Amino acid sequence: SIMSYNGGAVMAMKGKNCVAIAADRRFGIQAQMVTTDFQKIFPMGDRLYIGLAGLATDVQTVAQRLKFRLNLYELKEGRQIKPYTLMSMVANLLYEKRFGPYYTEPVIAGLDPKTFKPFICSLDLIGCPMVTDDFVVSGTCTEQMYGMCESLWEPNMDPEHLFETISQAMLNAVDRDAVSGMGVIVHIIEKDKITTRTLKARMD
Amino acid sequence: TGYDLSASTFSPDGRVFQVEYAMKAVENSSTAIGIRCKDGVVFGVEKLVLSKLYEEGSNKRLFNVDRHVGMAVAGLLADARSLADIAREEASNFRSNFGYNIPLKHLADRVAMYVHAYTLYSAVRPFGCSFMLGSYSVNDGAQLYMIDPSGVSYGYWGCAIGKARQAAKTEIEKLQMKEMTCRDVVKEVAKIIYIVHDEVKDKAFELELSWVGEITNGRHEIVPKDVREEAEKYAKESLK
Amino acid sequence: FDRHITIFSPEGRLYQVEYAFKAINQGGLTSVAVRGKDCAVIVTQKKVPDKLLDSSTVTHLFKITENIGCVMTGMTADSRSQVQRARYEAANWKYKYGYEIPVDMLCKRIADISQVYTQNAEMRPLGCCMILIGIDEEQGPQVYKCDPAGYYCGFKATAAGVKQTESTSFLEKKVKKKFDWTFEQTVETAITCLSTVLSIDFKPSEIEVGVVTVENPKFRILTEAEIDAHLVALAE
Amino acid sequence: NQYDNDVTVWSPQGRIHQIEYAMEAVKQGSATVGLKSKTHAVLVALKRAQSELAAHQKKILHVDNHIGISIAGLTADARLLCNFMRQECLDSRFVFDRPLPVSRLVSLIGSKTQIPTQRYGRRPYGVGLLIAGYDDMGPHIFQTCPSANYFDCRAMSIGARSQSARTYLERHMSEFMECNLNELVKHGLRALRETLPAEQDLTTKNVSIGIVGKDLEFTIYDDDDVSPFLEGLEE
Amino acid sequence: SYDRAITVFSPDGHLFQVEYAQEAVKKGSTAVGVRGKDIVVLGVEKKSVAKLQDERTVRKICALDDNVCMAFAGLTADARIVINRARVECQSHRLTVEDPVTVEYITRYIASLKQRYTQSNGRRPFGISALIVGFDFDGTPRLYQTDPSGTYHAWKANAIGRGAKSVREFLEKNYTDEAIETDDLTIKLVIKALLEVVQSGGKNIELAVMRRDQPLKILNPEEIEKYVAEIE
Amino acid sequence: MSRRYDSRTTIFSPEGRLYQVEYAMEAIGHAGTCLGILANDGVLLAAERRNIHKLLDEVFFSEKIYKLNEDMACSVAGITSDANVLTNELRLIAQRYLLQYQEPIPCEQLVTALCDIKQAYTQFGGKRPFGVSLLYIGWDKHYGFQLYQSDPSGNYGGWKATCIGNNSAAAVSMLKQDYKEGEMTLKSALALAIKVLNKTMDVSKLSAEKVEIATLTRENGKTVIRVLKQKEVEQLIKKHEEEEAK
Amino acid sequence: SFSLTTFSPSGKLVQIEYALAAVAGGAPSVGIKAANGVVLATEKKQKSILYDERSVHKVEPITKHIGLVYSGMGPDYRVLVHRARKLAQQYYLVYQEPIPTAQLVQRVASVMQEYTQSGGVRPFGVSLLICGWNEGRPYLFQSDPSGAYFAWKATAMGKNYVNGKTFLEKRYNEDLELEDAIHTAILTLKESFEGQMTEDNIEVGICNEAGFRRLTPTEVKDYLAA
Amino acid sequence: YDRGVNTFSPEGRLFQVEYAIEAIKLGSTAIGIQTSEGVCLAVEKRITSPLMEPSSIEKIVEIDAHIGCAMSGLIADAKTLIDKARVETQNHWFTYNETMTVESVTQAVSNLALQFGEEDADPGAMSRPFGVALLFGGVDEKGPQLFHMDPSGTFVQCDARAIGSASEGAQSSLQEVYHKSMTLKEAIKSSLIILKQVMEEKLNATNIELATVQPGQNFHMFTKEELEEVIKDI
């Protein structure tokens, strides 16, 4: 369908006190490939991120309405938004447009703005919020990404394990997909800092 | 004081002067009376002759609201003709909805809603005419209600409106109107108007009567010329 | 200037609203109501200026819904307007929430309609006070009185009209004695109130008495034949 | 005093002075007269020129084949009702394919006249309308007022100095029914004589007429055919 | 909403509201402009600030397009609305017609707004009078003045604001074929036109120039002093 | 309806000015004294608090100092109610700008955007104008550090230093005298506010609680805004405490 | 359709100036923020013994953690109850969280700002005291007819507020227990209110970690021991 | 100010409209001419300064090839009416594929003038009447036609009508000189004689503007050629 038009994938995981996010860089049209330099992950501010996949237009559209309503909430209240609260914003934003729906599969991961407490979740094409404390995968290669994650996922792992874990997850999974691949961006969210690495993958 | 400059402004004594002036505007109108009895409701109207140039039947103050509902008005004539079309369009919307003729209690209530709606705001003015709404039905019988500039319904066995009022109301109280029949009501209605009006300012007039009841088969109908003149001749006995 | 339209007076008053309070008082009719243990009674002055007028054609007791009665005091022009508007609400309540509207919300919605008249300078307050009665399954008998200003509160014994000052005093004298609350004996208290104030001994057609009970939540109007029974035979 | 500001304010005698002054503006302008027999109806309109260099204003507005009207009052105020009256008559033949009855049209025009009255901010129409028409029941002469009141008359004279004109119409009213089309114009033009002073009386140039009849549709005459109509009559 | 008439007539026929509008026009700062031979030059006096204001927002000489620029004298409030919505018309005219804007075309749509604001319900006539000046096709310059009432004129040399009549007296007397001969004499005339209403102002005069195909150019303060240095 | 009570703000005086606007500037003068300074290292903002009582709390960041966006802030002197209306409209215009161009709004663009809304009520609508005067600070990509002052009539302009509210004639006079154009920076020029706020306040012994100070400076490619520590401002006043003796 | 609020020659707002004059002519109201809770005390004065006390209450809850009191025109407060409650629900739709005190009073006062601007509507004749508990921080705010909301450790309003503030300059200390703050507010209204002091006339409510809870006359009778 | 726009006077007049016709006495003197051979309209430019260009200001503009214009009083009020007058004129040919008659031109303008109102309308409606006195001439298959219009909105066929400040004595003077079959060139003579007499400034090609319409010759604006000839041929 149109969700498979531009392809792409987004993956996110949670460690013990930390969370991890990784996604492919590929941007193309159907069978034709265009450019590998596209960015599917945008910073939401301190200790919070959001991923997006599916139609690339709504990825660059819906995400722009985020910081719009986000700043208005960050200007009125002197605190940053909670990731549990931000999930309600995107679900409400998709259900104002529900009738002729945007095309995307949001992915939200971060920490409790209050302290260290991690939280992760993902949404649906129609705007249904879904809270999963293990991992979230979205994209055209989704069915291929599950088996890799669920096999290698563990409840509590240090950032060192999360490095290789989601990496090896993405690598073998994204292989078997035709419309996803060719570069990977990885985001690691720690308490006092943030780690961001680039993975070497097959160009195909 | 400036407290009478608008209807939305209340008097320091707790009165509304603009609506009271509308009642005083009715006091400038010619005298009109109506009476209900067992057979039906009888109407009458004093029609003033301003000049001979007027055609017979001109300046008609008898309005037909609906099949079973007639109306007689006293006040500014055009304000009544404008509301008459409002009442006709209202009774028409009723039958178009519920599929039968609106009863007099229902129609006089919704018209009073339109009358009082214009007394509420400052952007409009109240009606300068007080009118009577008669009806007859086999389900109800002879019914007569009265609406005023304040938009309040008043049922009456007999009533009088226009310039001379209290004098005609007392004459109606002197004789029971419920026992008499519509055939004999037009006799007294004619005799009263001759007693009400004397020649001082105005010169001549004519009697305008209306019939609703069993004799009209439950339909608003004007008085025929033969019976009207016959009842006037019996009323001329008091004049001679 | 402030004495004409509705704007804040230098003393904090509202003269357009206060001149309305004299307009309810201008109607020349005194109304009283008492909330009993098992019942709530309303007694108002029924005036018939001329014999040509008819009884059932002019009445001060209106029915908002089956279980809620209404009495009105003031210039009748504003009387019929609120009742139709109240029936547009009470009926709308059932279309939305699906049950008979309580007396609490009915007085709240009617007040909000009257509150706009005071806040919005385009319109004017209405010259009739509204006393709404009824019964609920929790608080039992409910008696409220809504002024044109929009204020309403639970009144054990309420009064209105020219004699309201003298009526309130006699209503206090009965409650000061901790008067035992029974149905018909309370109906006397509301009737004897207006009877002792004016020093008349009214005829049965000169008063209009509504009633509501726990046994009969549907509002009823006391028959004039039953009025004559409890006037003459029981004056005691 | 303070009661003359708008229409909504009522006088303590129960009179609207704006409607009263609306009737005063009608008396401020050209006097027109019209009458009907059992067959033909004629509308005699008095045309007045500001100066001799300027020509005479048009007091007659053609409505339909069976309907015509003359205007006395504020000039341009009749243009709004004109285009409305013409649109209503066209809508009658556009739907019913039938000419709208004369009594039904005036009842609809009197409605549009009364609506702006009670509503504040809308100026009442300050022009009087003398309208005539023919139907299966014969001709009709309907005179209106800025108060929206309209009557049914055998003959009526409105405007300035219409007093002596109406007195002439009342005594000769008995003849107006039995006279034919030629005698209706004659006595109709001699009725216009009383509306003007003893110096300037009547000419065929400043006086135009129109007629409607049984088999004759409403027509308008100005000078040519009016010259034999006036001449041959004693005044 | 708010619906009523604002400007109404008078027993003498003159407009109370409009005359008070043109009064506020004269209460503003003095602005001048002329139509040169091959160029156009605008200028306006500056009330002397003491070591504070920034000249970015204070500049009263703006540009509606590359072809046409403008200046204003009056209340600074209503001036910015006209400048914004006139630039919208400049882009809307190029959007509707591929050909560039015409000075006479843009000018009339400007003054037409002030006419609408006068006769519209609830609106208000502006207290500004703007000088619309630019280049037509073939390079023929045009200078037009607006009015709060909505009329627009054509002027070879013009002065607006405070003392507009006083400078106009200097114009009509000293405006000849010798005036606006060359780019230098055109600018020196604008300076001298601002020397009558200036009291110990000095350097407060700021100038602007548009040269042929090039867009409005602002003369630097030192470039202004170069032409101001010659007085006597 | 009742044109008798219609004030008709749009009517011009016989002197050719506006009734409500002229009375609006006076209402601003009754408000508290607020000043601002544009320096090389950034913008300086200081505001007096005319409300003084032992029961005051002020749980917010500051009373008369607000934050417009990441790169800009503002102060206020005037009617306190209409200030929240203008503050919200500035936050709406700035964020709607971020939608189209995905870039921070420049200082001059955000100021002229609200001033069109301010004077739109003086042009028509019949609604009363705004009696709020606002100061504007921040940084933009082109013009950099900027300081702006607004008027209730909708007029505005750039300023290197200024003062609003009470004691406007005395403060601005004291400001220019020692003001160093493009020279005296945050550190040094911060002592001038305390020096001016002590002169503008008629009550002696200027307190750090009675005043509030906030600065905005972009460092390392990131805009940094903060409200100065009252404990340090006290020591910053302790400087002025020892200034008259030495 | 036209706003009657204009600027006086001195700059004051005449319509709002008389708005507070109506607030000062009402029943006295006080409040104290101390320890983990905030107390609000009002005086309900009927016109006789014939009016039911428990039928209508001056203290009304907005949400679980927020409640409001008032002194001024009664009917004008009923409009704010519907608009404040409806605003908090529109908040719970978007952010799915209870509304904070600072966010609520902001847009609630915006309703006051709208009717002091939009034409054909008079300003409010009421002044409200805002009580809220969020994230362990007690919040006591005071709103006026003009729409300006401030922050107060303690405050007094209505009638005799000058003597009420004088009591707060002394009787109010820091580290004060909420229970002692309730009896302290009773001592503040001891001089103002005269006649018979009962538990039905005074109406008190508080908000704490457990949320906003209105006090019953039976509990108030125990709190009247002073 | 203590009065309304539609308020009637005790003598049956409108306060508003009465001052409209009272306001036009300060306008510029202009006179129309209707001749058997065509229609002629002249207007005084009334230039207040040599820097003001008399060529840019035009009080006579071309709606259709037949119909001209005239202006007096406030100039922009006429421009507002002429704009919509030229739109409906082309809307005529857009439908019927023919030129609009002189009568239908004034009928459209009379409708636009009668719509004046404030309450119970849209903000895009004209609130106050125009201070312009309109003269609409033209020549069609019916022949030369010249109409007069005032702030009231009426239109009447007339040979000549004077507008402006001098309209008092000019209209009586136009009556005396113009009679019978007098043609174009003979009309320009008596036109420039009466106009030069009443206005302060002496007759010049740039001080006034003149244009004519003929059956065979459509609306022709007189340039410096025709203007300088008729002023010396007076």
Author numbering:
A (entry chain S): 2 to 205
B (entry chain R): 6 to 245
C (entry chain L): 9 to 244
D (entry chain Q): 4 to 238
E (entry chain O): 2 to 233
F (entry chain N): 1 to 246
G (entry chain M): 7 to 232
H (entry chain P): 8 to 241
Copied sentences from the primary study:
Proteasome activity is fine-tuned as a result of the association of the proteolytic CP with diverse proteasomal activators (PAs), including PA700, PA28, and PA200, that can induce the opening of the CP gate into the central proteolytic cavity, allowing substrates to be degraded. However, lymphoid cells and cells exposed to cytokines such as IFN-γ alternatively express three homologous subunits (β1i/LMP2, β2i/MECL-1, and β5i/LMP7), replacing the constitutive ones, in the 20S immunoproteasome (iCP) particles—with this alternative expression resulting in a change in the proteolytic activities. We determine the uncharacterized cryo-EM structures of free bovine iCP and the single- and double-capped PA28αβ-iCP and PA28αβ-iCP-PA28αβ to resolutions of 3.3, 4.1, and 4.2 Å, respectively.
Interestingly, PA28αβ overall displayed stronger interactions with the α3–α4 side of iCP but no binding with the opposite α6–α7 side, consistent with our observations of the slight leaning of PA28αβ towards the α3–α4 side and more intimate interactions with iCP on this side. In our PA28αβ-iCP structure, all seven activation loops of PA28αβ were resolved, with the ones interacting with α1, α3, α4, and α6 of iCP showing stronger pieces of density.
